[PDB]
Amino acid sequence: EVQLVQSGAEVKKVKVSCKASGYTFTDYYMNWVRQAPGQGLEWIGVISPYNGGTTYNQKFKGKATLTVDKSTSTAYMELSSTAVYYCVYDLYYFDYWGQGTLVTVSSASTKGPSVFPLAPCSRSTSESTAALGCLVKDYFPEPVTVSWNSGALTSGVHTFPAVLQSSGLYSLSSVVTVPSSSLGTKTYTCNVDHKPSNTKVDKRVESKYGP
Amino acid sequence: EVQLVQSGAEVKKVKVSCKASGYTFTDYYMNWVRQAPGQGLEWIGVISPYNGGTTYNQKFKGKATLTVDKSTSTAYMELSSTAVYYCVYDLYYFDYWGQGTLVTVSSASTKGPSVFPLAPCSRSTSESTAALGCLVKDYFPEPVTVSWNSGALTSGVHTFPAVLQSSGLYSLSSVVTVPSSSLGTKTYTCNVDHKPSNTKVDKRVESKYGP
Amino acid sequence: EVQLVQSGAEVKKVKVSCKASGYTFTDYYMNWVRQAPGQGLEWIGVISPYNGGTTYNQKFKGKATLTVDKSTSTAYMELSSTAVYYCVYDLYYFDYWGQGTLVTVSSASTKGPSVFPLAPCSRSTSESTAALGCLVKDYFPEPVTVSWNSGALTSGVHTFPAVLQSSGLYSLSSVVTVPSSSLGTKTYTCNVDHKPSNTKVDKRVESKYGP
User: Fold this and answer.
1) Which chains touch C (3 or more CB pairs under 8 A)?
2) What is the rounded CA–CA span in Å between residue C26 and residue C18?
3) What residue segments make up the domains of chain C, in order of their start?
4) Partners of residue B206 in chain C, C-beta under 8 Å
5) Are C77 and C56 in contact (CB under 8 A)?
6) What is the CB neighbour count within 10 angstroms for residue B112?
7) Which of A39, A64, A189, C69 could share a disulfide with A60, CB 3.0–4.6 Å?
């Protein structure tokens, strides 16, 4: 079928590939469209494969520049300095969606997280099914991959989305689980593996000489 | 008459001058046109001298930018990163052709050649009018200037065009001559003078203790 | 027995080791002595192993400094900016000579040679047992190792000592052989292998379209 290969994830404080594959090129129109994270869809432009007919968006004619590579069926959209991006065909429709290409508008540097968890053994005060969770803090870029005891504890896992700091653009996540109070001799290690910084974080938390 | 001064030859991995001379400016339209090497003619654009009316080619509006210098009768076409270029007047016609401005789209560095000739004295095996020639290899940029014995031997000279390597963009030429076998006590020195690298190469080849 | 380990060959524009081995230390006196190349023997000094009793030469008290390392049976002679060096014991005698430690006073840089040979096939003019030889030129440091046809031709080999240039302190050697004139279909390749620059040179020479 009409299948696409997009590339790729980038961090900039800018070309985007869209490889056409599986069919006859110069039959369908490269149509770029973006989606701001957590937002609607913002159409960008349509270029013909016969020629670089621009017809951009009113708002996107400056930042976004679509180019044509009609020999080898890829096409390119370039950018000057925050969303995910898509290339579709069949300009009246939109049926031939690409991969999804996230670009960040970022100035942050690549860093591993600093997890500041609490994993008590459900013996905080008195509650039977008490919770615990890790505080995956100050990493860049996206994402972190968190597993409980190398992915052993799977029930009650509630991974929260990466809320982005206004501090240093170092987003924040937290994954929590709810064990029972009759599990006091069980540690639970969130295994945070921020792979674009190649940092692997393992945690647990103890008491403070209680009664 | 309407005579033009173009400038100039450049190597880039980009402004091009076209000086109008000999007549009254703002009477004829600066019209740029390129020719890919060994190809046809690709029209680019027409600017008025009254104002920068663009009307570029569909394909050339991004890479090529024509500007106007209507005070001093030159005009400029600028470029962002492979052909020869021409400026003509009289937009309905094309009668007032300029010089010819070659620009290379190049990444190679300026180097002298490495000639690996064969100049036997027409005594290879048995042939009366046997040939000899030099192998002008691995130079940049264009051209090399080859002369046989400081240009003494002029008959039989067959300079071949600079076939360009896909190796390091170091083009290759070869100039050959056909002397006779009763010229065994005559060396023939191709005098390869690659002037943009200021390298001067002189050659000859001997036998290998034959019979 | 009393056996010594000296170290080592150095090039300076400076400590010298002398490891005592095979016997009981503090029984014999470390006695340094040098030999300028192609010259006699110049005594330097005597240190006791009990203490650094200097008693240097009158001329060598400034440049040469002997030190003691009476724990681990080595001893050291240090130097400030051209000869070979020796450590001996038994100060009244001299029977316990060390290895030999060449130090050069040099400013030259490490370079491979540039051999400019002549290896004609004993057909220069008319002589039956005519000679040939390579011109091992402009190398640093010492030495070069030359072998004829990977050491095949061993008779008539006359390796000449490295005569040192006053040009750039790049010494010169030449190795020659005398084959016969009925060996015209035999090339002879001196295989010059300057190992401290790791350069391997192989040569031969042909005629010039003779009769």
Assistant:
1) B
2) 14
3) 3-104, 114-202
4) 206-209
5) no
6) 19
7) A64
Q: How far is A80 from chain B (nearest CA, A)?
A: 15
Q: How far apart are CA A190 and CA A177, in angstroms?
A: 10
**Structural contact between residues A83 and A37, judged by C-beta atoms closer than 8 angstroms:** yes
Q: Are strands A101-104 and A10-11 parallel, antiparallel or unpaired?
A: parallel
Which approach determined this entry? cryo-EM
Give the nearest chain A residue to B63 (CA atoms). Answer: A67
3-state secondary structure of A52: coil
Question: Out of 2.60.40.10, 1.20.1250.20, 1.10.760.10, 3.40.710.10, which CATH number does the structure's domain A114-202 have?
Answer: 2.60.40.10
CB A106 within 8 Å of CB A12 = yes
To the nearest 5 percent, what fractions of chain B are helix, strand and coil?
A: 0, 35, 65
Contacts of C206 in chain B (CB under 8 A): 206-209
Query: Tokens at residue B45, please?
Result: 């654009």
Could you report how far apart the first and last alpha carbons of chain C are, in Å?
67
Instruction: Quote the distance between the C-alpha of residue A169 and its chain's center.
Output: 14
- Identical fold, B3-104 and B114-202: yes
Amino acid at C84: V
Interface list for C 37-96 with B (CB within 8 A)? none
Is A151 touching B (CB cutoff 8 A)? no
**Chains C/B: 3 or more C-beta pairs closer than 8 A?**
yes
Touch between C and A (at least 3 CB pairs under 8 Å): no
Nearest residue on chain A to B60, judged by CA atoms? A52
Q: Quick one: CA dihedral B163, B166, B170, B174, positive or negative?
A: negative
What tokens appear for A129 in the block?
């099914």
Chains that touch B (3 or more CB pairs under 8 A): A, C
> What resolution in Å is listed for this PDB structure?
3.7
Q: Is C4 left (phi over 0), alpha (psi -120 to 50) or beta?
A: beta
Residues 6+ apart with CB under 8 A from A60: A42, A44, A45
Dist CA B108 CA C162 (whole Å): 43
Please enumerate in sequence order all residues whose Cβ is within 8 A of that of A170, keeping only pairs 6 or more positions apart, or say none: A108, A111, A137, A138, A139, A140
* Residue ranges with strand state E in chain A: 3-7, 10-11, 16-21, 30-35, 41-47, 64-68, 74-79, 83-88, 101-104, 132-139, 158-159, 171-177, 191-194, 199-202
The CATH homologous superfamily to which domain B3-104 belongs is: Immunoglobulins (2.60.40.10)
Is A51's CB within 8 Å of B62's CB? no
Residues B34 and B87: their CA atoms lie apart, in Å, by 8
For residues C132 and C119, the answer to whether their CB atoms sit within 8 Å is yes
CA distance B132 to chain C (A): 15
